[PDB]
Design a protein around this ligand. Sequence first.
Ligand SMILES: *[C@@H]1O[C@H](CO[C@@H]2O[C@@H](C)[C@@H](O)[C@@H](O)[C@@H]2O)[C@@H](O[C@@H]2O[C@H](CO)[C@@H](O[C@@H]3O[C@H](CO[C@H]4O[C@H](CO)[C@@H](O)[C@H](O)[C@@H]4O)[C@@H](O)[C@H](O)[C@@H]3O)[C@H](O)[C@H]2NC(C)=O)[C@H](O)[C@H]1NC(C)=O
Ligand SMILES: *[C@@H]1O[C@H](CO)[C@@H](O)[C@H](O)[C@H]1NC(C)=O
Ligand SMILES: *[C@@H]1O[C@H](CO)[C@@H](O)[C@H](O)[C@H]1NC(C)=O
Lengths: 18, 99, 265
Amino acid sequence: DFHHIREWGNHWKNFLAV
Amino acid sequence: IQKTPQIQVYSRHPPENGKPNILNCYVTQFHPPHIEIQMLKNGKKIPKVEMSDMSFSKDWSFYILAHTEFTPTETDTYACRVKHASMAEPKTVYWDRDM
Amino acid sequence: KNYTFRCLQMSSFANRSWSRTDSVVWLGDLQTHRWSNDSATISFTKPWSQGKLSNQQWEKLQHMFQVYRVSFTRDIQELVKMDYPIEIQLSAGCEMYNASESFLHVAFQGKYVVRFWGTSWQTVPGAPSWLDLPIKVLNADQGTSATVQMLLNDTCPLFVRGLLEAGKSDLEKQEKPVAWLSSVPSSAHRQLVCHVSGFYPKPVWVMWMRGDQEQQGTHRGDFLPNADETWYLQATLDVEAGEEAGLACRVKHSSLGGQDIILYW
Ligand SMILES: *[C@@H]1O[C@H](CO[C@@H]2O[C@@H](C)[C@@H](O)[C@@H](O)[C@@H]2O)[C@@H](O[C@@H]2O[C@H](CO)[C@@H](O[C@@H]3O[C@H](CO[C@H]4O[C@H](CO)[C@@H](O)[C@H](O)[C@@H]4O)[C@@H](O)[C@H](O)[C@@H]3O)[C@H](O)[C@H]2NC(C)=O)[C@H](O)[C@H]1NC(C)=O
Ligand SMILES: *[C@@H]1O[C@H](CO)[C@@H](O)[C@H](O)[C@H]1NC(C)=O
Ligand SMILES: *[C@@H]1O[C@H](CO)[C@@H](O)[C@H](O)[C@H]1NC(C)=O
């Protein structure tokens, strides 16, 4: 469940981190 | 759950016959968001009607503002007609400058 | 003044092959952004809608949300696979005070079902039990949890502080009400109507009066929007025939510099 949103969140975590 | 739209029709400026004005039709409290809104002059669809982006309130129900330029006269009637899945028939509300 | 920043997403799913997602963003009662399904790009509805963010920063945030929107759509369609039509709404943003509180609420078929709170997604009491498993699975992904936490705890209130600075002259604008009186019959009685239009900001005082005596029959309507980012309001009074004489509508508003509008019936 929520495969793409989970992929999305993991993709953009570093962008928001820095 | 389905929610039936409420319709309010009002002018931007004090109505004066022969003076250009704007007529607003504010449609609220509806769900689902799919809706057809027409503004009418003497029962005929007005072609140039601008719509706001649909939005929703704290209670989750949707709202939208339709508006059109109009010049009131003694004899012309204006209305807002709404089609929505919550209602078997379209709902029409007439502009009344007195109310 | 406290401002509530709201990002509103409206997603409709008619069947397996048809969906649309549209978003709007509000700061208080002023719309700052729109994002149509048909547009690849988020549209600014103010000169100051980028806030204090750089062009590169905005380009990437836009890209991030572009992937969110596609990802969201795919996941819901797959959740349905594992009854149409389906309506989902999300309301996310922050209330400003220099403190703030963020929120992220989700509604399914017009009813509030889920929020993000602290570090996790939570179903609200009385939400359908079929949500529990999907939400448990969503909470297992720490990356998205962190992403949402950074978005709410940091990215939101920082963005909003910048919007408040860049949009000051619009946020603090004063537009004067114009008022007019009319009436209609109400019984075997008359209803007098005081219309007040074109004012901004929203707070206003409207009352029927006999000299200095407030008429407690005054019935204030809802605040209705004009299309030019001003407000409209009417206040009515049911009056017996012959008691119309000596009535006035009085309007107080911040734009008027202490000089109330008074119209006499
Ligand atoms: C972002 O900020 C949140 C808290 O802020 C709220 O949520 C965010 C999303 C915004 O909406 C804000 O406006 C809100 O105010 C932080 O969440 C906290 O994280 C910590 C660490 O993970 C949690 O601490 C744990 O709590 C356990 C006990 O919890 C229970 O009891 C407490 C009261 O005692 C109660 O508040 C809570 O609801 C539970 O009932 C404890 O066992 C454990 O050892 C640890 O102390 C804390 O509970 C979270 N707060 C909430 C309200 O859930 C985020 O960590 C922060 N993220 C970042 C990245 O900064
Ligand atoms: C999907 O929904 C759209 C929009 O209502 C409709 O036009 C279309 O016929 C539907 N298609 C199927 C296969 O159900
Ligand atoms: C919404 O946008 C997506 C992606 O471009 C597209 O596939 C879809 O057909 C659009 N929906 C409608 C109703 O036009």
